[PDB]
Amino acid sequence: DAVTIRTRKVISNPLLARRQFVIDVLHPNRANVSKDELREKLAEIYKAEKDAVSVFGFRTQFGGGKSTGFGLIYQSVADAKRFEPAYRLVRYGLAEKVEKASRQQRKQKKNRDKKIFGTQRRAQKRAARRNA
Amino acid sequence: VHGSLARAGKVKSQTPKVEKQEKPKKPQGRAYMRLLYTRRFVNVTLTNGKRKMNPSPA
């Protein structure tokens, strides 16, 4: 209801081929909209694609209503993929959260490779022959 | 007339036991300040320059 998008402190960022500014939502009678919704409104306002828009860090003033945030308007999915981290892309869907094990499991494996010199196959076959 | 360790707890033991009385709770916080401010400066009960705050019933 009467959602408005208000921008200040705009930096044209060619080094990362993007653009940095601050984004304010003026929404009454509502909790707040999802970040993705601000991405579609930013897209419609600035006639850029959805995947070239990224926003983050939204906080509302005391008393409800108005919220601030920070957003990036890239100039391709290619650019928004070149200059961006994995967690934002997993948020949107432009990537996938890689299925690594836990930190303890990975560290324990890496320490467990410190007890073998040379290739794993060599040790495996050697131990198999000695366990006959 | 002496004592010893045997008579320990005598008076607290033989005190007739009386329970505390159910009574309305008093306000906690700034309402208690309201109550004191009235009883001391609004409903003052001055007695010829002798203000008693726990006068015995007599």
């Binding site: - | 002496h2 320990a8 707890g9 005598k10 607290k12 033991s13």
Partner: protein, 143 residues
């Protein structure tokens, strides 16, 4: 006049003279002799735990006449034997031989309090629970 040196170059005399005479100040002398660390029953702490060795009743000093209920205690940390006092009518019955009590001073800084001869500490807890709760039955003695 006044019997102290006033000269502009007399600082060493004044400083050493003050240093000598602070030894007559009991607080300063206790602190710099390390008496609390080397001779106090608690070794300089605020509280100490112990084991009850017996019970004792001590006749109060004049002009009072009563029997103060006190326990003989040996401390865990150093094995010293101290006499503590249990407050609150009906709490000598909460302490038994070979119980572990927690002690504290009477607030007079190593001196005796009141009409109680030669007693310097008060029992705070017994068997891990405070005497204030056992007296008011908020808790019961675990055995």
């Amino acid at each position: 006049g006044k019997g102290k040196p006033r000269g502009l170059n007399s600082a060493r005399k004044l400083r050493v003279h003050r240093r000598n005479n602070r030894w007559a100040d009991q607080a300063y002398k206790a602190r710099l002799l390390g008496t609390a660390f080397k001779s106090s029953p608690f070794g300089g702490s605020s509280h100490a735990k112990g084991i009850v060795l017996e019970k004792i009743g001590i006749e109060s000093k004049q002009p009072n006449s009563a029997i103060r209920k006190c326990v003989r205690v040996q401390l865990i940390k150093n094995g010293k034997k101290v006499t503590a006092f249990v407050p609150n009518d009906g709490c000598l019955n909460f302490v038994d031989e070979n119980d572990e009590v927690l002690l504290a001073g009477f607030g007079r800084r190593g001196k005796a309090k009141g009409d109680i001869p030669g007693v310097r500490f008060k029992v705070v807890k017994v068997s891990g629970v405070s005497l204030l709760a056992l007296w008011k039955e908020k808790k019961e003695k675990p055995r």
